[PDB]
Design a protein around this ligand. Structure first.
Ligand SMILES: CCCCCCCCCCCCCCCCCC(=O)OC[C@H](COP(=O)(O)OCCN)OC(=O)CCCCCCCCCCCCCCCCC
Ligand SMILES: CCCCCCCCCCCCCCCCCC(=O)OC[C@H](COP(=O)(O)OCCN)OC(=O)CCCCCCCCCCCCCCCCC
Ligand SMILES: CCCCCCCCCCCCCCCCCC(=O)OC[C@H](COP(=O)(O)OCCN)OC(=O)CCCCCCCCCCCCCCCCC
Ligand SMILES: CCCCCCCCCCCCCCCCCC(=O)OC[C@H](COP(=O)(O)OCCN)OC(=O)CCCCCCCCCCCCCCCCC
Ligand SMILES: CCCCCCCCCCCCCCCCCC(=O)OC[C@H](COP(=O)(O)OCCN)OC(=O)CCCCCCCCCCCCCCCCC
Ligand SMILES: CCCCCCCCCCCCCCCCCC(=O)OC[C@H](COP(=O)(O)OCCN)OC(=O)CCCCCCCCCCCCCCCCC
Ligand SMILES: CCCCCCCCCCCCCCCCCCCC
Ligand SMILES: CCCCCCCCCCCCCCCCCCCC
Ligand SMILES: CCCCCCCCCCCCCCCCCCCC
Ligand SMILES: CCCCCCCCCCCCCCCCCCCC
Ligand SMILES: CCCCCCCCCCCCCCCCCCCC
Lengths: 309, 100, 480, 101, 162
């Protein structure tokens, strides 16, 4: 039962499982880091045990399938979106030809967690808060793709390894700077991170959609949010900061350093920036970031076509 | 290795199911749902035909089809909201005033 | 293929109408002004007519794998542009009575005209589908423009649901045709067949589903039941556009599809279209017999007249002058329908709000609106195929084309349906002059009156002297 | 049908399966263990998202083949983006995207 | 790619059959999302990678979001239709099911008897679709922008609140 094809497929499966487990544990440790900066591993294990052994109470007048399905979406959407990220040469889960399109697929599916939690939580205030949150996430998902499309235009393909190889000389943060800032804003706003934390706080007729979620479903929402910011940071690294490319260190060391830097910067901008008003956020999205992505795509195309003799 | 007949039969089954949902359902929302099923089935049939010939025209026809699907879903849901706010009733048999 | 500058010259009405859409939309974004945006729309459409002159000064050529421009396309572009200009002119007083936003109307009319132009030049299944949808969706908006009124909302919902279903049928038929034949162009539908194998079952099923969609769009039996409800519920300028421009553009692209496709001369499709034409003529005339509502009556009239046009289409792959007959009939039908629906629009303008009634009440119209009554009775005689009217010249063309192709069942159908039309059209035209017991002052209403008067004068003059229209249509021939 | 592509297919399948099964097992363990005892503006912004997402799909298709389309494709996409931006300007100016009127 | 095609087609058929015969709108929309994901898997099995990506991005990620938005804001809690279930009565569904079965039989008979070399399933990339889209299909793209503008204007005019 020994054959190098079986050894190769088993080692690739083992690499994918290792990547998955490291991402989940890093999401849990980032939850710990945010809760402490604003043993610890033993405290997180205690939290997991407490959420396991607390009774899961689904409300009586609530739809069971939608209520159960919302945290599953909130976890699995961006946790599956991680699968295209190349962390090292020969350490990618899926070398998909669609790549960043697969990430867009997963984010578009990720809005359903908020919508389903708000509808299934049988409360009018929670429904209104979820409607506001979903309107905000649509307002920033409208330009997430175009902010990526500048980098896609420079690389000439949707594949992530091709983007990393095309960032061999100069990282895409320099030419695609406006794409970088728009993608950072859209990635923060899709994951409901600060300053886009609580759109329901602007009205007393609305409530957060995480209310009525107790125990393991609340834990799924929590760890899913942190895993979402982990995969957003990894995509940011692979799309604008060379991925695994560096002069001296091993490639995984460079990728891990850049991803940890971006996770800490997300923590810092949570601790520092104040949250704007809801209409300010919606207006800023629809009126500034979408035209900026369109103009950045036009300018990138003009520069690419000029610099091709 | 996948036959063209099987893909076209799958698209035909989905189209027929969407048409049945459009006919038998009295709620206007489910009529819009059946319309979406029908247009998605026709777009799937175009994708199957394009993949059989190895041409990109099937996916282009899919793109035009889903542009139509998005725009007419927007229009139909706007009309559904107008009907709801003017009558508080989504029964499609109630909006039948003009007759021969 | 790439677009040379000459190809850009051949796209001139399409480019001018698209630029007018952009300019009118930006003007609305600047300031919501009814007069300026209506003026910009009509200026763009007139510039598209002059661009048609410039296109005629160029050649006839295939601008894309998708579009082909020739005299056929120029004639149908002119008809669609005339219908859109008349619709805007009739719309201004009616929208002057309106209370909400009244410039999105002109934006939607421009986009529907753009779809009509695309269908006029459509040489491809993609361009056919896109032109039908560009006609349809602005008409979803326009039919329910006064959505606070019950009838307009009802007509909008019916038209939207049924046109989405018909577009699904048309798209599924196109997909089956593309599954059979590897190319989506008109000239290649049935090209890969021979030795009596033209009636491939998948190709025939695809053309059948396309026939379902197009026959919905053309109000052909048995896809005709929407027509009186939507015609009655829509605003009267919207009813004018829906009767003229949509039907003319969709029938033109159907004419070109059946001219260019090698499966066009199929016996099965010809027999099915003969059944549909027979049923359309007889059913439209029979259902219009006992109508007191003028708009429902004109809907059934549209069913029967599209049946006559379909009779002219059936003889296309056998005779020669079927294209000339369709052109002459479509010019006459356009002017008659513009006059009739314009009288209906002018007497229902300004808009009386969603709560007030909108019945025409045409009895005794002569004793307070004599000129509009004269225009309406000229149009009623023209739709009846009475000699000294252009409608008779079109009917004579249809009869000659049917006699040349030995379509005797369709000839007898035209005769019987014409007699039934005589009854109900004469009922309307003589009710115009009776006595009714009981039941303006701006230049745009006068412009609408001038439009219906010029349509009446064109109908009378070209019914007496039809040689200029025949000479114009005969030089507007497509690529052979 | 090479070894690397089937290895990555199996790795991707195992990633999806183990991920969804991990979430399922988390919920199963949470449920089993332990003792017992509107406004039309939302429609407007969602519809705007749908329309601009379809136009974004057209730009997605363009962005991956910019060099193969040349300057002619640039002109066509510039006209597309101009119409898109004019529609956006119209929506902003008429108060469609104004959340607080 | 064959087993994936057949199992995803089966899932799509079962999901839309559950869609058209369900009473809860949110459940029906969820089953519709499942059918759309299955159809995207069918697209990926045939090599139409761009079409499957857009099936999840646009159809299952934008249009169905709009449907869920409308259902949530109208708050269907059984307004005289759920308490009736007239479509489950035999006299309402039996006729149209017979008509649709006849249409399916005629269409499927037309499908059979057509020459078939089989679908290769080779990946047609989004680069080739983009080349065709901005090559021989340019006017389709421009007038599709006009079509989406028309839908935008119509939906704003009808669906605004005031
Ligand atoms: C409660 C559970 C609900 C259902 C959850 C999901 C069910 C399915 C789970 C099992 C999946 C089994 C594995 C599927 C195949 C994986 C490999 C694959 O997709 O390969 C095909 C293709 C390869 O392409 P490439 O490598 O670029 O080129 C090779 C040249 N032919 O690559 C592609 O085509 C890649 C694109 C397809 C990727 C699909 C990923 C899953 C999408 C659904 C996510 C659902 C999220 C949760 C629910 C949301 C709300 C309903
Ligand atoms: C009076 C009788 C009744 C008239 C009714 C008309 C109804 C339809 C209106 C539009 C019809 C357009 C038909 C054009 C067919 C042209 C066919 C053709 O091949 O034309 C070529 C010709 C130039 O000649 P040639 O040398 O052949 O060119 C090739 C050289 N490379 O080039 C041409 O011929 C150029 C044609 C230009 C047409 C410009 C039209 C401007 C608009 C006029 C509207 C008048 C008012 C009507 C409405 C009244 C109110 C309701
Ligand atoms: C309700 C009122 C309307 C009624 C329906 C319309 C009229 C129906 C007429 C039916 C005619 C049936 C003809 C059957 C044979 C057809 C094929 C054939 O061989 O035709 C002979 C001939 C063409 O063959 P060919 O070799 O070219 O010979 C040329 C010399 N004749 O053919 C020809 O050359 C031309 C044949 C012309 C046939 C007569 C057309 C005039 C009809 C006059 C009025 C209707 C009949 C009388 C009234 C009935 C009651 C109303
Ligand atoms: C001898 C046989 C061989 C020769 C055949 C020659 C055929 C052509 C010449 C004869 C035509 C006969 C027509 C008979 C009906 C004349 C129309 C008529 O009587 O109209 C009056 C009537 C309206 O009056 P009233 O009944 O009071 O009102 C009801 C509505 N409130 O109106 C109505 O009630 C409704 C009228 C509907 C439209 C008129 C009917 C058209 C029927 C088809 C005409 C062609 C017939 C072809 C041949 C058939 C067999 C002879
Ligand atoms: C080029 C990039 C344009 C992006 C526009 C994005 C946008 O929506 O901008 C909104 C902006 C201000 O609009 P608003 O805030 O409503 O104005 C109140 C001021 N009294 O709107 C504006 O500043 C107006 C838009 C100006 C440019 C388009 C209109 C003129 C075009 C002429 C041809 C070039
Ligand atoms: C298992 C029984 C049912 C259990 C419940 C349902 C679970 C999901 C079942 C459907 C999805 C998985 C089907 C099995 C896929 C296995 C992988 C496979 O077949 O890969 C082959 C192929 C790889 O691509 P290619 O390079 O062309 O291959 C030829 C090699 N030269 O692959 C391809 O070309 C594309 C592979 C499929 C596309 C990606 C996955 C789509 C997932 C759709 C999920 C739909 C929603 C499911 C909801 C379930 C709960 C109700
Ligand atoms: C926040 C970062 C998440 C990363 C998830 C994936 C981790 C993969 C670890 C791979 C380690 C080996 C990489 C190849 C060898 C090069 C480095 C050698 C020294 C560690
Ligand atoms: C040749 C044109 C035929 C159609 C137009 C008919 C209208 C012509 C102009 C109007 C004349 C109307 C006269 C009405 C007289 C009514 C008298 C009633 C009491 C005896
Ligand atoms: C309800 C209204 C019904 C109207 C019917 C009109 C019928 C008119 C008469 C048609 C006669 C057709 C005869 C065709 C004979 C063809 C013979 C061909 C021999 C080769
Ligand atoms: C190969 C280098 C070419 C340089 C010159 C490029 C400019 C000339 C060709 C422009 C073609 C543009 C076509 C745009 C069509 C837009 C149609 C809009 C319809 C609404
Ligand atoms: C109030 C009227 C409601 C009608 C609903 C639709 C009925 C359609 C019946 C079609 C039956 C076809 C059977 C095969 C022939």
């Amino acid at each position: 039962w020994i054959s190098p094809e079986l050894i190769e497929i088993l080692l690739t499966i083992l690499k994918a499982v290792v990547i998955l487990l490291v991402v989940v544990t890093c999401g849990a440790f980032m939850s710990f880091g945010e809760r402490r900066l604003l043993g610890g591993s033993l405290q997180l294990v205690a939290d997991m045990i407490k959420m396991f052994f607390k009774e899961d109470w689904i409300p009586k007048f609530s739809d069971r399938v939608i209520f159960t399905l919302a945290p599953m979406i909130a976890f699995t959407s961006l946790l599956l979106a991680f699968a295209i990220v190349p962390v090292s040469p020969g350490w990618v889960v899926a070398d998909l030809n669609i790549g960043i399109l697969f990430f867009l697929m997963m984010a578009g599916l990720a809005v359903y967690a908020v919508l389903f939690a708000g509808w299934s939580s049988n409360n009018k205030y929670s429904l209104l808060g979820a409607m506001r949150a979903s309107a905000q996430t649509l307002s920033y998902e409208v330009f997430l793709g175009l902010s990526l499309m500048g980098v896609v235009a420079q690389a000439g393909s949707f594949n992530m390894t091709d983007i990393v190889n095309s960032q061999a000389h100069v990282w895409n943060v320099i030419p695609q700077f406006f794409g970088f800032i728009t993608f950072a804003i859209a990635g923060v706003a899709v994951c409901h991170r600060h300053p886009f934390d609580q759109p329901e706080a602007e009205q007393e007729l609305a409530d957060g959609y995480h209310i009525e979620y107790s125990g393991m479903k609340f834990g799924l929402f929590f760890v899913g949010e942190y895993i979402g910011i982990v995969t957003i940071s990894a995509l940011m690294v692979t799309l604008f900061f060379g991925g695994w490319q560096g002069p001296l260190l091993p490639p995984f060391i460079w990728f891990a350093l850049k991803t940890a830097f971006f996770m800490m910067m997300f923590i810092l901008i949570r601790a520092s920036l104040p949250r704007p008003r809801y209409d300010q956020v919606m207006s800023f999205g629809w009126k500034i970031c979408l035209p900026l992505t369109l103009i950045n795509l036009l300018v990138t195309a003009a520069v690419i076509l000029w610099q091709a003799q | 290795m996948i036959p063209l007949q099987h893909g076209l039969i799958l698209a035909a089954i989905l189209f027929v199911l969407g048409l049945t949902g459009l006919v038998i359902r009295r709620n206007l929302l489910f009529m819009l749902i059946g319309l979406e099923i029908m247009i998605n089935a026709s777009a799937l049939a175009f994708v199957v035909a394009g993949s059989y010939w190895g041409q990109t025209d099937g996916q282009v026809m899919y793109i035009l089809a889903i542009s139509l699907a998005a725009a007419e879903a927007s229009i139909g849901l706007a009309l559904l909201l107008q009907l709801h706010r003017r009558r508080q009733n989504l029964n499609i048999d109630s909006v039948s005033e003009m007759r021969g | 293929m790439t677009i040379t500058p000459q190809n850009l010259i051949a796209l001139l009405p399409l480019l001018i109408v698209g630029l007018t859409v952009v300019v009118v939309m930006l003007s609305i974004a600047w300031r919501r002004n009814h007069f300026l945006n209506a003026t910009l729309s009509v200026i763009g459409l007139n510039a598209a007519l002059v661009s048609l002159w410039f296109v005629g000064q160029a050649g006839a050529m295939d601008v894309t794998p998708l579009m082909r421009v020739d005299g056929f396309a120029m004639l149908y572009t002119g008809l669609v542009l005339l219908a859109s200009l008349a619709t805007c002119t009739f719309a201004y007083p009616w929208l002057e009575g309106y209370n909400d936003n009244k410039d999105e109307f002109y934006l939607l009319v421009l986009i529907a005209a753009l779809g009509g132009i695309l269908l006029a030049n459509a040489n491809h299944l993609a361009s056919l589908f896109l032109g039908i949808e560009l006609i349809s969706l602005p008409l979803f908006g326009l039919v329910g423009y006064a959505f606070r009124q019950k009838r307009s909302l009802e007509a909008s919902i019916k038209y939207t649901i049924l046109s989405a279903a018909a577009s699904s049928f048309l798209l599924f038929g196109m997909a089956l045709v593309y599954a059979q034949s590897g190319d989506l162009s008109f000239v290649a539908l049935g090209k890969n067949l021979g030795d009596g194998m033209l009636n491939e079952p998948l190709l025939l099923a695809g053309f059948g589903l396309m026939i379902v969609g197009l026959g919905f769009k053309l109000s052909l039996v048995p896809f005709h039941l929407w027509t009186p409800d939507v015609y009655q519920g829509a605003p009267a300028p919207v009813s004018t556009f829906l009767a003229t421009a949509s039907k003319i553009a969709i029938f033109g692209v159907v004419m070109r599809l059946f001219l260019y496709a090698p499966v066009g001369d199929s016996e099965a499709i010809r027999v099915v279209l003969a059944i549909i034409a027979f049923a359309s003529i007889i059913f439209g005339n029979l259902m219009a017999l006992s109508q007191t509502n003028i708009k429902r009556l004109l809907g059934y009239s549209s069913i029967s007249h599209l049946g006559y046009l379909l009779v002219a289409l059936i003889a296309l792959q056998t005779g020669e002058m079927s294209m000339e007959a369709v052109g002459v009939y479509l010019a006459g039908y356009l002017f008659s329908s513009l006059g009739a629906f314009g009288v209906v629009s002018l007497m229902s303008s300004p808009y009386r709000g969603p709560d007030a009634d909108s019945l025409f009440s045409y009895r005794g119209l002569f004793w307070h609106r004599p000129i509009l009554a004269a225009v309406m009775t000229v149009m009623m005689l023209s739709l009846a195929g009475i000699p000294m009217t252009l409608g008779f010249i079109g009917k004579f063309y249809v009869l000659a084309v049917g006699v040349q192709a030995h379509l005797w069942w369709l000839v007898g159908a035209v005769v019987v349906g014409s007699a039934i039309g005589l009854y109900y059209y004469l009922r309307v035209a003589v009710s115009l002059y009776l006595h009714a017991p009981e039941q303006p002052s701006n230049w745009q209403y006068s412009a609408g009156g001038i439009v219906v008067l010029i349509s009446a004068l064109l109908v009378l003059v070209l019914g007496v002297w039809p040689q200029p229209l025949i000479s114009i249509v005969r030089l507007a021939m497509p690529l052979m | 049908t090479s070894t690397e592509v089937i290895a990555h297919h199996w790795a991707f399948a195992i990633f999806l399966i183990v991920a969804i099964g991990l979430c399922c097992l988390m919920l199963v363990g949470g449920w089993f263990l332990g003792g017992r005892a509107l406004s039309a503006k939302f429609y407007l912004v969602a519809m705007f998202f749908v329309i601009f997402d379809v136009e974004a799909l057209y730009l997605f298709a363009w962005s991956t083949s910019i060099r193969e389309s040349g300057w002619v494709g640039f002109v066509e996409a510039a006209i597309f983006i101009f119409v898109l931006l004019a529609g956006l300007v119209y929506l902003v100016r008429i108060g469609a995207l104004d959340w607080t009127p | 790619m064959e087993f994936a095609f057949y199992i995803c087609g089966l899932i799509a058929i079962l999901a839309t059959l559950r869609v058209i015969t369900h009473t809860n709108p949110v459940h029906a929309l969820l089953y519709l999302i499942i059918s759309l994901l299955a159809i995207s898997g069918v697209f990926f099995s045939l090599g139409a990678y761009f079409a499957g990506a857009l099936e999840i991005i646009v159809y299952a990620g934008a249009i169905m979001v709009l449907f869920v938005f409308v259902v949530m804001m109208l708050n269907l809690g059984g307004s005289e239709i759920e308490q009736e279930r007239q479509w489950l009565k035999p006299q309402v569904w039996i006729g149209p099911a017979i008509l649709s079965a006849i249409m399916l039989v005629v269409i499927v008979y037309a499908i059979l008897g057509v020459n078939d070399q089989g679908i290769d399933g080779t990946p047609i990339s989004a680069k080739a679709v983009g080349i065709t889209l901005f090559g021989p299909y340019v006017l389709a793209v421009e007038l599709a922008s006009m079509l989406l503008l028309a839908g935008l204007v119509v939906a704003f005019h009808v669906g605004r609140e005031e």
